[PDB]
Amino acid sequence: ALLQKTRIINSMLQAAAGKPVNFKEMAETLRDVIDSNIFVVSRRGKLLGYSINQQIENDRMKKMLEDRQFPEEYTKNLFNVPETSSNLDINSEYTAFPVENRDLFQAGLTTIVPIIGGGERLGTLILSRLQDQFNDDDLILAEYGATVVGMEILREKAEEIEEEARSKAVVQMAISSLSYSELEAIEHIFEELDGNEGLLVASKIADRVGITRSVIVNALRKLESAGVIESRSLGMKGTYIKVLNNKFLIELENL
Amino acid sequence: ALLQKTRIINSMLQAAAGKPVNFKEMAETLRDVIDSNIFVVSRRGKLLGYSINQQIENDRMKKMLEDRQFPEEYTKNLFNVPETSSNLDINSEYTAFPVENRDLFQAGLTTIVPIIGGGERLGTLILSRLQDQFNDDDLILAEYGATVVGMEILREKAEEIEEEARSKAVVQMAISSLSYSELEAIEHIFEELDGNEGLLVASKIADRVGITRSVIVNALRKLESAGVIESRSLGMKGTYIKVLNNKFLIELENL
């Protein structure tokens, strides 16, 4: 019953809007829609999700469902596949696969669609039934489905790193905003500290370090200012901090 | 064969990848694989791109094709469509459209798809033949179709501002690294200046402003460093400069 079938696939997509990416509850969707087996493997060939409904004969797939890694020779060509291969097992004649890719498709009549977003193969969609041949409708669905879980990892991954170089801009911001002293204080602080959690009253360092309180006491708050650290001191008599940004200590040690 | 017609689409989708989003050249690729009229209009109702073959009886649409600005009464109810209107003109019986959108659909047995990604109705997609019914799959194409133009405005507008908020980003930079002095200078400079184009001679400012050539002449380079302005000084005897970022000048005035 076509169109609905998809409109349904679409229904699902619209819906992932805010909610962060989630393959499985989306693999399901394809399973449901296409009534097929569904496994999504990334470029690196880690399964990000899959789903099923009845047991199978495929011995050489589970290996990965236990270490997330699939070895540097197997999934390897699984990737070399230039296009969709339509209907597939262990008894059809073709010289499109080399004799080093024998057992990967294995059990349940398997079909294959490459996931292919922003100009790049981001991975593969395995589908694999047992009996019912893979219909022209049935394909069209996957191709949408792939195309969908296409610009999704895309999405997910941008998300994933656009908030790396957030953190990372942040930190060379604040650090960009200290005096030779202030930062030197900060420096000497965490050289003589451990982790985000830190307590040793500023008072102490000053005399040792030979930077006034006043300042040390301040470099400090400059970080309260672009978030990076937290303390809300307890009337001197001890001074404690914890950090709000992992990429920091890192950077700071990068000095 | 519909699938072909679909995969054909796919192929054009991969091959936008690098190339900067082109609507027409996809409006066509629709009007190809669908065999109909394609018109992509937006949230605000601008016709981004379109694509036809024969001559048409819609009068009330040749309006936007010169001002790009559709009425605050037409496109809007065009916006109001909760979902895909399958076939249309002006003889049928329906209590959807409000008594204020009679002639927008005018020519071509018209059909309607809303474009929705980033969990947002990005705009509307308009197909319109003359006789042939829009079939099931005619839809099926059309929709996915949208869905692409879909996450294309996404990519374009995404692209639009990750680079408006670049300018801004770099100018808040450059400036931010200006000593009060230096800043004082660039200031005094452009206040007695007109547009991105300037020839006024450093020597003469210092005095008139109370600052060393030393520093004027420093603060200038600084912005060429961060490229914001161009000058290749001449051997004094007249300095001439140019601004290479619009956002900049704006920002100055906002200090």
UniProtKB/Swiss-Prot annotation, chains A, B:
One of its GO terms (cellular component) is cytoplasm. Changing residue 60 to K: Retains some ilvB repressing activity in a BCAA-containing medium. Changing residue 206 to V: Strong defect in ability to interact with the ilvB and dpp promoters. Residues 1-154 are annotated as: GAF domain. GO terms for molecular function: DNA-binding transcription repressor activity; GTP binding; transcription cis-regulatory region binding. The keyword Transport does not apply. Keywords: Activator, Cytoplasm, DNA-binding, GTP-binding, Nucleotide-binding, Phosphoprotein, Repressor, Transcription, Transcription regulation. Changing residue 60 to E: Nearly complete loss of ilvB repressing activity in a BCAA-containing medium. It comes from the Bacteria. Changing residue 217 to D: Does not bind the ilvB and dpp promoters. The modification Phosphoserine is found at residue 214. Coiled coil: none annotated. It is found in: Cytoplasm. GTP binds at residues 50, 68. Changing residue 97 to A: Strongly affects the ilvB repressing activity in a BCAA-containing medium. DNA binding is stimulated by GTP, but not by branched-chain amino acids. Residues 202-221 bind DNA. Belongs to the CodY family. Modular protein made up of an N-terminal effector binding GAF-type domain and a C-terminal wHTH DNA binding domain, separated by a helical linker. The GAF domain is involved in the formation of homodimers. Amino acid binding to the GAF domain is associated with drastic but localized changes in structure. Structural changes upon isoleucine binding may lead to increased affinity of Ile-bound CodY for its target DNA. Homodimer. Homotetramer. Homodimer under physiological conditions, but homotetramers are observed in the crystals. DNA-binding global transcriptional regulator which is involved in the adaptive response to starvation and acts by directly or indirectly controlling the expression of numerous genes in response to nutrient availability. During rapid exponential growth, CodY is highly active and represses genes whose products allow adaptation to nutrient depletion. This is Global transcriptional regulator CodY. It comes from Bacillus subtilis (strain 168). The gene is codY.
